[PDB]
Amino acid sequence: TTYADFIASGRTGRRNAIHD
Amino acid sequence: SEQESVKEFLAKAKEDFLKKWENPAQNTAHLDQFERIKTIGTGSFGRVMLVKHMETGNHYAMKILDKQKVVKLKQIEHTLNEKRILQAVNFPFLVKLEFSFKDNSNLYMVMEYMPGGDMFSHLRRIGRFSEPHARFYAAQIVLTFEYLHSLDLIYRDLKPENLLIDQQGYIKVADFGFAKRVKGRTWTLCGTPEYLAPEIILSKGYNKAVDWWALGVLIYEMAAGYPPFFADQPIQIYEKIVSGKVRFPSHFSSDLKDLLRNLLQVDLTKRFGNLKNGVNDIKNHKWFATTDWIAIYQRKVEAPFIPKFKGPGDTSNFDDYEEEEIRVSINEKCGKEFSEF
Numbered sequence: 001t002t003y004a005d006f007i008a009s010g011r012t013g014r015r016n017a018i019h020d
Numbered sequence: 021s022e023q024e025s026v027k028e029f030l031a032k033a034k035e036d037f038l039k040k041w042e043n044p045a046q047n048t049a050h051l052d053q054f055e056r057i058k059t060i061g062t063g064s065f066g067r068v069m070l071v072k073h074m075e076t077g078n079h080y081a082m083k084i085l086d087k088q089k090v091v092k093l094k095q096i097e098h099t100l101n102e103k104r105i106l107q108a109v110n111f112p113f114l115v116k117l118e119f120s121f122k123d124n125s126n127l128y129m130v131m132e133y134m135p136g137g138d139m140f141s142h143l144r145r146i147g148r149f150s151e152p153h154a155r156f157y158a159a160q161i162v163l164t165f166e167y168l169h170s171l172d173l174i175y176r177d178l179k180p181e182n183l184l185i186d187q188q189g190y191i192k193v194a195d196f197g198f199a200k201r202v203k204g205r206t207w208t209l210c211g212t213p214e215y216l217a218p219e220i221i222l223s224k225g226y227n228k229a230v231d232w233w234a235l236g237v238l239i240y241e242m243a244a245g246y247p248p249f250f251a252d253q254p255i256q257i258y259e260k261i262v263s264g265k266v267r268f269p270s271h272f273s274s275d276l277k278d279l280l281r282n283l284l285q286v287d288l289t290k291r292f293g294n295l296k297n298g299v300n301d302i303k304n305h306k307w308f309a310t311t312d313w314i315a316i317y318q319r320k321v322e323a324p325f326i327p328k329f330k331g332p333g334d335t336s337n338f339d340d341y342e343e344e345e346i347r348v349s350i351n352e353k354c355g356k357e358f359s360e361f
């Protein structure tokens with residue numbers, strides 16, 4: 001499932017902002 | 021009209037903001053007025069600590085920025101934006117800046133403390149929010165963006181991590197590190213990968229429409245439990261966003277889908293929030309037809325979730341971080357760069 005793919009991904013913790 | 025009471029609201033709000041904008045509060049406390057308790061947030065752009073003001077006993081969240089780290093990250097002007105904007109604004113769903121000051125090494129911004137934690141932590145734990153739950157929060161954001169954009173402010177970092185839950189179950193937007201007062205277009209690349217509009221990614225020069233696109237991402241994530249565009253690495257997320265394709269879960273109501281297709285709209289002449297009717301295209305949309313906008317502003321609506329009150333300085337709703345010294349050099353660093361802070 002989509003939820004299962006999300007939960008196994010490396011981006012389920014707090015995400016950092018980016019910048020150039 | 022409801023649009024005219026509203027115009028009147030915003031006129032008063034703007035005259036209030038400009039007075040502080042043109043003459044900002046400065047140097048309103050000192051570090052040694054605060055007892056440090058615990059680091060409740062850390063990152064590239066400084067850390068946030070629970071503190072306690074001795075003279076009042078009040079608990080507060082104190083953001084610390086190392087001036088030398090800000091200069092190396094080229095965040096000088098953004099940092100100055102952030103403080104000048106936060107000190108001038110006044111709205112129920114914006115975290116309130118109580119004090120700011122600086123010493124030889126650091127910049128400090130003391131905000132009101134929300135023990136209830138961020139939306140992120142509750143959203144991840146519960147999995148997803150019901151449509152009514154997600155709508156309640158979305159309304160607060162919709163109104164906040166109405167207020168911000170009326171002041172010429174773009175926020176540029178909407179995500180559940182930047183949204184705190186207070187003791188009545190309402191949200192407060194925190195972190196103004198990329199907010200800017202701009203009347204035309206701007207070009208800085210900034211935001212969080214999952215929430216970036218296509219025009220930022222493609223380096224085009226954008227406006228406040230990017231904030232409404234990020235609203236669509238937020239509502240999607242709140243109701244789905246995951247964001248519309250995810251992958252393991254940013255560049256793969258960028259390819260998904262610019263592709264123009266999005267898939268909704270089969271549980272999304274048909275009104276939610278239609279709202280989201282107009283928020284996550286690549287074409288800027290068609291994106292809700294950016295058209296001749298502005299924010300009323302969002303406010304009058306069918307997904308929001310049960311929303312009483314004034315009672316949300318007034319905090320009279322019953323909240324879907326009130327977080328567990330554990331004391332005024334309780335920290336159990338935040339994770340644990342490695343505690344570092346607050347070191348203050350005997351020599352002034354970057355005096356000139358931060359003179360206006």
Ligand SMILES: C[C@@H](N)[C@H]1CC[C@H](C(=O)Nc2ccncc2)CC1
Pocket residue numbers: 014060061062063068081115131132133134135181182184194195
């Ligand atoms: C993830 C970052 N963009 C940032 C989100 C907000 C957080 C904060 O101010 N927390 C807070 C403020 C006031 N009261 C309680 C917690 C600091 C880290």
